[PDB]
Design a protein around this motif. Structure first.
Motif, PDB file in Angstrom:
ATOM      1  N   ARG A 185      -7.970  95.507  55.703  1.00 24.42           N
ATOM      2  CA  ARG A 185      -8.050  96.589  56.670  1.00 24.42           C
ATOM      3  C   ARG A 185      -9.228  96.397  57.608  1.00 24.42           C
ATOM      4  O   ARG A 185      -9.137  96.704  58.799  1.00 24.42           O
ATOM      5  CB  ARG A 185      -8.165  97.919  55.937  1.00 24.42           C
ATOM      6  CG  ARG A 185      -7.487  99.055  56.625  1.00 24.42           C
ATOM      7  CD  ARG A 185      -6.833  99.954  55.620  1.00 24.42           C
ATOM      8  NE  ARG A 185      -7.797 100.500  54.681  1.00 24.42           N
ATOM      9  CZ  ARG A 185      -7.543 101.506  53.860  1.00 24.42           C
ATOM     10  NH1 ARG A 185      -6.359 102.089  53.830  1.00 24.42           N
ATOM     11  NH2 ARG A 185      -8.504 101.942  53.055  1.00 24.42           N
ATOM     12  N   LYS A 186     -10.352  95.917  57.085  1.00 19.83           N
ATOM     13  CA  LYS A 186     -11.475  95.588  57.953  1.00 19.83           C
ATOM     14  C   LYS A 186     -11.092  94.491  58.929  1.00 19.83           C
ATOM     15  O   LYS A 186     -11.446  94.545  60.110  1.00 19.83           O
ATOM     16  CB  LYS A 186     -12.677  95.162  57.117  1.00 19.83           C
ATOM     17  CG  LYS A 186     -13.487  96.319  56.587  1.00 19.83           C
ATOM     18  CD  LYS A 186     -14.706  95.844  55.823  1.00 19.83           C
ATOM     19  CE  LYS A 186     -14.325  95.194  54.505  1.00 19.83           C
ATOM     20  NZ  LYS A 186     -15.504  95.022  53.613  1.00 19.83           N
ATOM     21  N   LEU A 187     -10.363  93.487  58.450  1.00 16.20           N
ATOM     22  CA  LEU A 187      -9.916  92.413  59.329  1.00 16.20           C
ATOM     23  C   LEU A 187      -8.983  92.933  60.416  1.00 16.20           C
ATOM     24  O   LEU A 187      -9.049  92.489  61.564  1.00 16.20           O
ATOM     25  CB  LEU A 187      -9.229  91.329  58.508  1.00 16.20           C
ATOM     26  CG  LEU A 187      -9.070  89.972  59.180  1.00 16.20           C
ATOM     27  CD1 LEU A 187     -10.249  89.075  58.852  1.00 16.20           C
ATOM     28  CD2 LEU A 187      -7.777  89.334  58.739  1.00 16.20           C
ATOM     29  N   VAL A 245     -15.075  83.811  60.067  1.00 20.83           N
ATOM     30  CA  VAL A 245     -13.768  84.378  59.758  1.00 20.83           C
ATOM     31  C   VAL A 245     -13.770  85.882  59.978  1.00 20.83           C
ATOM     32  O   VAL A 245     -12.834  86.440  60.560  1.00 20.83           O
ATOM     33  CB  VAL A 245     -13.360  84.031  58.315  1.00 20.83           C
ATOM     34  CG1 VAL A 245     -12.097  84.771  57.932  1.00 20.83           C
ATOM     35  CG2 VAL A 245     -13.145  82.545  58.173  1.00 20.83           C
ATOM     36  N   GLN A 246     -14.816  86.564  59.521  1.00 17.33           N
ATOM     37  CA  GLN A 246     -14.806  88.017  59.555  1.00 17.33           C
ATOM     38  C   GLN A 246     -14.737  88.575  60.968  1.00 17.33           C
ATOM     39  O   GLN A 246     -14.436  89.761  61.126  1.00 17.33           O
ATOM     40  CB  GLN A 246     -16.041  88.564  58.838  1.00 17.33           C
ATOM     41  CG  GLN A 246     -17.339  88.374  59.600  1.00 17.33           C
ATOM     42  CD  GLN A 246     -18.563  88.694  58.762  1.00 17.33           C
ATOM     43  OE1 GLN A 246     -18.450  89.085  57.600  1.00 17.33           O
ATOM     44  NE2 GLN A 246     -19.743  88.526  59.350  1.00 17.33           N
ATOM     45  N   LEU A 247     -15.002  87.761  61.992  1.00 21.06           N
ATOM     46  CA  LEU A 247     -14.991  88.225  63.372  1.00 21.06           C
ATOM     47  C   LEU A 247     -13.861  87.662  64.217  1.00 21.06           C
ATOM     48  O   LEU A 247     -13.601  88.207  65.294  1.00 21.06           O
ATOM     49  CB  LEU A 247     -16.317  87.881  64.064  1.00 21.06           C
ATOM     50  CG  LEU A 247     -17.563  88.557  63.494  1.00 21.06           C
ATOM     51  CD1 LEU A 247     -18.818  87.999  64.147  1.00 21.06           C
ATOM     52  CD2 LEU A 247     -17.483  90.064  63.673  1.00 21.06           C
ATOM     53  N   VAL A 248     -13.193  86.591  63.780  1.00 26.42           N
ATOM     54  CA  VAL A 248     -12.202  85.908  64.600  1.00 26.42           C
ATOM     55  C   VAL A 248     -10.932  85.577  63.835  1.00 26.42           C
ATOM     56  O   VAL A 248     -10.018  84.981  64.402  1.00 26.42           O
ATOM     57  CB  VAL A 248     -12.802  84.631  65.228  1.00 26.42           C
ATOM     58  CG1 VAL A 248     -11.805  83.950  66.151  1.00 26.42           C
ATOM     59  CG2 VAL A 248     -14.079  84.965  65.975  1.00 26.42           C
ATOM     60  N   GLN A 274     -17.409  97.819  65.373  1.00 20.30           N
ATOM     61  CA  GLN A 274     -17.201  97.955  63.945  1.00 20.30           C
ATOM     62  C   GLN A 274     -18.021  97.013  63.079  1.00 20.30           C
ATOM     63  O   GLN A 274     -17.972  97.148  61.854  1.00 20.30           O
ATOM     64  CB  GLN A 274     -15.719  97.756  63.611  1.00 20.30           C
ATOM     65  CG  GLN A 274     -14.832  98.782  64.264  1.00 20.30           C
ATOM     66  CD  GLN A 274     -13.437  98.759  63.727  1.00 20.30           C
ATOM     67  OE1 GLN A 274     -12.532  98.215  64.354  1.00 20.30           O
ATOM     68  NE2 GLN A 274     -13.245  99.349  62.555  1.00 20.30           N
ATOM     69  N   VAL A 275     -18.764  96.073  63.652  1.00 16.19           N
ATOM     70  CA  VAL A 275     -19.604  95.199  62.850  1.00 16.19           C
ATOM     71  C   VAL A 275     -21.026  95.223  63.385  1.00 16.19           C
ATOM     72  O   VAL A 275     -21.981  95.422  62.627  1.00 16.19           O
ATOM     73  CB  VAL A 275     -19.042  93.768  62.823  1.00 16.19           C
ATOM     74  CG1 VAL A 275     -19.971  92.846  62.064  1.00 16.19           C
ATOM     75  CG2 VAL A 275     -17.668  93.763  62.195  1.00 16.19           C
TER      76      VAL A 275
END
Lengths: 310, 192, 104, 206, 155, 192, 192, 153
Positions: A233-235, B82-85, D163-164
């Motif tokens: 869900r964060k992704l 990965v967590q951003l793209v 969000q980050v």
């Protein structure tokens, strides 16, 4: 407060699964309120009157208009009565200490007056020992039939879990049930977030001869699946839904169905059998090979029920 | 208090201890146990214990351990990207690194204290699990160069064998280990 | 340039000077398109929709590597004599291109 | 990030910059969406034109082999070579390079489209115009896809920021504030303790 | 830092603030007063008919909105260029620069309120009539149409 | 200090008050008065007052209020797409939700304090206007399912009837209310 | 202490001094000296010294100094967008501003205390370098308006002369400056 | 924490500092000395023609500038993405990596100042000769060009 009243109403011990087979006995409730408002006190009194438990309960009521330093005696008197009943008359007592945040605020008031060495945010350096003297008065004794269970309720300041009050409580207590503001805003009751919630004494109370054998693995698998679902869900909130692989889409659907059918149950009383049924139904949404926390035998026995529960 | 490691007690201890086993609440929230932050922990005894390992576990044990540490470091580097793209944006080599890092996390680093077999693990068993993971990684890298799809690799059945290896008992583990080592080559020959 | 479609239209495409080809099956169309793209050469390749609705999706393994070949879903013949929903095609294209899957 | 007043002020400035960047990128995506929908309308027009041309050209071809021998049409197609009728010039759109096929299309390069057949030559004209329309459709589609992936990239960047990045800066600000306030509290307690002890000493022995 | 105790308490007690800007100062503008973060809490009770002019409040609101749009578009042009802007975005871009050069930057001049309102209307005339949402149509009819040459010779 | 709700005074207050009426200057900038934000505000008295409503207002008042709240939540959940693209690009159902949110806001949540009759409202009047809006919503949803043009639904005079419900005097509200409910019932049957 | 400029000593000094030469740790880490934080520095003596500069350096020295300051402020403004989207995403004029800010930083504000010539600079040498840089900026802006790529601007060899101006002795500098002022015009005329 | 009173006062008293970095240590680089926060106040006293070699100070300055550019581009890739980099930016990325892996990572080996300057020049030769603005053209002529492969591999 709603969750505490519901637990007090629905709390039962289920000797049939344990194997003793003897008829149960009801819970005595000792209720200690510190700095309680009239609205909350009205809610609790009405609930107990509705369920008839006000005859088998003891109420100590320090209201928010009552003296502050008296707030330190209330839980101690409540627990004295609880231990007396349990370990001299063989009762099973359930203690509810509402707003232990008020207790800690009173303790800080006194400590500041006496100019003792503070700790982290003005709270006295002995706050940990003081809270332990209240919390470690629960348990079960050898050669005694009675018991004392505690369910303290504390409001985390600014929802901050690293605040000294929640932080020190979590070092003393045996786990914690943490409510989620997000789930509450989504309309979920009871809004219990599983990931920041833990129970440390669960293993000594579930499995063979207590509940049924798949309980622990089912819980572990639910934790793994929900953690993956929250990560996906964060992704999604960054890279959009359409880019998800099919397995990740499955985990998303699991997270949603979990929040909407497992966590959300309103004011219903669910036996352990129904909860486990719902759990396996949600787990059946995943491919049978991704259930790595569950042994093959249990997957064979219980996997494959749809969400047709009614 | 609050998990803060900048406090007097932790800081005063860190000046004198030879190992720093750092627990993490993020890992404990996901029911990853023992919940040790391998990125933030250290040990000042690893160099001195190498002679003992080379004769009591395996002559190449330190090299396997170093390879696993390097794979974890690469995974840590790639996770921020990965967590951003998104995972799909990576190349196939990096995707394989992410998958093997996950295998290491779930199948090697995780350990169940309440399980009848997984509570205790011997050095030989740890070496065997590491050797299986690294063999799978080498074969998978070869396959990627041979044009094999990542999905084909991930859907293999040997992955289940590695994933259940920690629950196998000591008295029968070496047989399981030999069989799985054979199966790894057998499976990566099947994909061709 | 070039085109892949049913042999009935490929003859006309070649009659206009395009390197036409006849596709007998969806698998045949995909294989021929992979051969065409893998070979370095012509720049435009229109693919009959009926046999391969999403040529870019199928050839994803190459177009992601090379950006000169311009794939294109072209309308089928028998369909052409009866018409086709362009609006639906564009709705699907919008869904693919911005993902938000909404139009009006 | 060391807890200092300077670090806190820098971190607050970073929060402000992140918010401003979010607004700026939202405006960029607004402009991109407007242009995108303009191109969607254009593409609808181009695809409709291509469909009409496909209809007419298929019609013409059907009659060509129906009157001129199907063998005649096949031979005419075989004679015509795959001429290099386009130039794949590139065009720049919002910082990206996209092809813009240009139909050089030498008509004389078609060998043996006319002769014994009476209508096969005309069917060649219909299919040449059809190829022109197909080129136009390709030109519009490439542009639309490029603008679409630019929109997607901008939206991913905005979501990343919202969000980050921004929550991380907020968490850092809260942490630094807590540390600084705690240090001030400790110093104040120390001063009060020392002054109280000195006052007691003066009371006891002056 | 506006969160420093001095300005925090002062804002608690006072009724607005006039904020100077270092960007405007280092661009040469004097007095370097930035309208965007500035506010006078009691302005509405001391402007209007019978005190200043009937068009004061709406002219102020419109100037604020137009200047904010202009600054945002100024940041947007650096990325998407002037061609990608619409004509109105370009007019706001021009208005913001004119505002900085002729409204804020008055040097050591002594402007009566009528002169300042004249300059404000001259600047607003750059925007197309009907894009001045926050001003009644009567005031637009009465004052719209002034030329920048009245202030162009004395930045 | 600057609207930081984490200030100690605000946090202590929110531990003891049963209702939080969050005023927002953003709404007042948009000329929406009272400037109360329905997303950040809350009340802890609704459940204890429900029995009173069911006897003094109407048996279904809690359900209608909950329906209005859910509609507002649905509107708030569609601002991530209405922002990216105007309301015109949304499908029929989503745009219906957007317009239902607009009508809720402008004709039930707003209240002129300087108006002769709108400055005050009774519980019967609020319940009537909620019932008006929700009945219109049900009929409009049914019509859209029947393939009616959403724009036609946006031009009905019944909406203008609902808009003026704020300004009808208490002595005159009941007749207005019954007449307008009947007009709602008869306004979508007329519309093909 | 800690480099914190919010200390009592620095803040009390900041309220009584006329000039404030703030030093930057980031620049000192890159060995860019004098390492003055331009954004955080100021002087209150500029307006009082203008007559002296006109009489003793050059009549238009104040205007050139102000032009340099405006360029630096513009670069500081665009650096936010650069940190947001990267330098290649900028339009041509903005990239020119960034590049000319860099030229100012490296060819005018950078000074080598341990060099034989650059350790000291006269006011006239500073005026010459400033005039060179401003003329280059104007001609580059004109070129960009006529459609010259930035990459082709940044490769012009006259930039090397501008970058080596610092090292020209005080006696030789006037001739060097005249040659460079001719060469800038030549270079941007030759571009056509 | 470098702002802690002990390091802070020390640095204000001492003539430089060699600051280690945990980030380099975790990558396996020994000695894990981070050059940007380190300093030697008296270095100019004991380097240069007649002391170590005529190119020493300028080579040190060039190394600092190049490494700083590399770290900046590392911060940039997190925003723009690697594929968007320019050729010069990519070259500075490669320089930063090679610098860390070959100039800083030396293990327990004893390097003479000649070998150290040779490694520094080999790394600087990875950048275009016109990007070396801190070094005089005489030294660039005399020392530029040699490849790192000649030293190792």
């Amino acid at each position: 407060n709603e969750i505490a009243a519901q637990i007090a109403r629905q709390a039962t011990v289920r000797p049939d699964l344990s194997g003793e087979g003897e008829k149960e006995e009801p819970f005595a409730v000792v209720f200690a309120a510190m700095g309680i408002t009239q609205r909350e006190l009205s809610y609790f009194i009405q609930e107990f009157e509705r369920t008839g438990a006000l005859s088998r309960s003891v109420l100590f009521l320090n209201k928010a208009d009552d003296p502050t330093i008296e707030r330190i005696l209330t839980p101690r008197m409540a627990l004295t009565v609880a231990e007396y009943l349990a370990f001299e008359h063989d009762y099973h007592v359930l203690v509810i200490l509402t707003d232990m945040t008020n207790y800690c605020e009173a303790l800080r008031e006194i400590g500041a007056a006496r100019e003792e060495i503070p700790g982290r945010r003005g709270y006295p350096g002995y706050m940990y020992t003081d809270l332990a003297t209240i919390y470690e008065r629960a348990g079960v004794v050898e050669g005694k039939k009675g018991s004392v269970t505690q369910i303290p309720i504390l409001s985390m300041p600014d929802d901050d879990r690293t605040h000294p009050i929640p932080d020190l409580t979590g070092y003393i207590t045996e786990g914690q049930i943490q409510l989620s503001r997000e789930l509450h805003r989504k309309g979920i009751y009871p809004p219990i977030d599983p990931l920041p919630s833990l129970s440390r004494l669960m293993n000594n109370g579930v499995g063979k001869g207590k509940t049924r054998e798949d309980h622990k693995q089912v819980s572990d698998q639910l934790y793994s699946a929900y953690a993956n679902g929250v990560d996906i869900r964060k992704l999604v909130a960054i890279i959009g839904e359409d880019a998800l692989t099919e397995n990740d889409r499955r985990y998303l659907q699991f997270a949603d169905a979990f929040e909407r059918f497992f966590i959300n149950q309103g004011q219903q009383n669910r036996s352990i059998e129904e909860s486990l049924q719902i759990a396996w139904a949600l787990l059946s949404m995943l491919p049978q090979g991704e259930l790595k926390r569950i042994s093959k035998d249990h997957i064979g026995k219980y996997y494959g029920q749809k969400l047709e529960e009614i | 208090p609050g998990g803060d490691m900048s406090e007097p007690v932790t800081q005063s201890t860190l000046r004198i201890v030879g190992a720093f086993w750092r627990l993490d609440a993020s890992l404990a929230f996901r029911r990853h146990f023992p919940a040790i932050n391998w990125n933030g922990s250290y040990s000042l005894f690893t160099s001195a214990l190498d002679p003992w390992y080379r004769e009591n576990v395996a002559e190449d044990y330190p090299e396997l351990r170093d390879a696993i540490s390097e794979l974890l470091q690469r995974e840590a580097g790639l996770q921020e990207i990965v967590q951003l793209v998104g995972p799909d944006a990576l190349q196939d080599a990096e995707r394989l690194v992410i998958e093997v890092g996950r295998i290491i996390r779930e199948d090697f680093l995780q350990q169940n204290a309440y399980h009848e077999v997984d509570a205790y693990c011997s050095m030989k068993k740890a070496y065997g699990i590491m050797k299986m993971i690294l063999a799978f990684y080498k074969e998978a890298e070869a396959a990627i160069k041979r044009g094999v799809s990542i999905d084909e690799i991930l859907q293999l059945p040997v992955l289940e064998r590695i994933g259940r290896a920690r629950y196998v008992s000591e008295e029968e583990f070496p047989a399981y280990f030999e069989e799985a080592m054979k199966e790894i080559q057998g499976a990566f020959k099947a994909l061709a | 340039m070039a085109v892949i479609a049913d042999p009935e239209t490929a003859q006309g495409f070649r009659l206009a000077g395009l390197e036409g080809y006849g596709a007998s099956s969806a698998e045949e169309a995909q294989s021929l398109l992979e051969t065409l793209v893998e070979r370095g050469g012509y720049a435009l390749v229109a693919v009959d929709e009926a046999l391969l609705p999403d040529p870019e999706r199928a050839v994803e393994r190459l177009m992601r590597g090379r950006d000169l070949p311009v794939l294109l879903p072209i309308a089928g013949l028998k369909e052409a004599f009866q018409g086709h929903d362009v609006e639906g095609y564009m709705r699907e294209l919008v869904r693919k291109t911005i993902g938000f899957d909404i139009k009006l | 990030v060391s807890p200092t007043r300077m670090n806190l002020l820098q971190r607050r400035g970073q929060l402000r910059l992140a918010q401003k960047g979010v607004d700026l990128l939202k405006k960029k995506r607004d402009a991109l969406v407007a242009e995108f929908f303009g191109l969607v309308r254009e593409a609808m027009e181009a695809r409709k034109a291509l469909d009409q041309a496909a209809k007419e050209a298929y019609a013409a071809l059907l009659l060509a082999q129906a009157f001129d021998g199907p063998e005649v049409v096949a031979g005419a197609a075989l004679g015509v070579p795959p001429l290099e009728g386009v130039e794949a010039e590139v065009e720049n759109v919002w910082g990206s390079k996209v092809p813009r096929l240009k139909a050089t299309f030498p008509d004389g390069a078609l060998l043996s489209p006319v002769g014994t057949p009476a209508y096969t030559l005309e069917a060649s004209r219909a299919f040449r115009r059809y190829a022109e329309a197909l080129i136009r459709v390709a030109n519009t589609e490439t542009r639309l896809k490029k603008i679409g992936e630019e929109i997607k990239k901008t939206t991913r960047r905005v979501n990343a920021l919202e969000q980050v990045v921004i929550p991380g800066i907020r968490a850092q600000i809260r942490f630094i504030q807590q540390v600084l306030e705690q240090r001030e509290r400790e110093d104040t307690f120390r001063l009060k303790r020392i002054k109280g002890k000195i006052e007691a000493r003066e009371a006891e022995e002056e | 830092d506006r969160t420093h105790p001095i300005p925090d308490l002062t804002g608690y007690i006072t009724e607005g603030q006039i904020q100077l800007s270092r960007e405007l100062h280092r661009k040469g503008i004097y007095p370097p007063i930035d309208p965007l973060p500035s506010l006078s809490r009691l302005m509405n009770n001391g402007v209007g008919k019978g005190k200043t002019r009937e068009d004061h409040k709406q002219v102020s609101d419109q100037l604020y909105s137009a200047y904010a749009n202009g600054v945002d578009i100024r940041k947007l042009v650096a990325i998407i260029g002037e061609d990608a802007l619409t004509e109105n975005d370009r007019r706001y871009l021009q208005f913001a620069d004119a505002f900085e050069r002729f409204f804020i930057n008055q040097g050591q001049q002594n402007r009566s309120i009528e002169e300042s309102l004249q300059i404000a209307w001259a600047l607003l005339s750059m925007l197309p009539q009907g894009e001045l949402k926050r001003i009644s149509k009567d005031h637009i009819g009465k004052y719209y149409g002034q030329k920048l040459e009245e202030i162009w010779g004395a930045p």
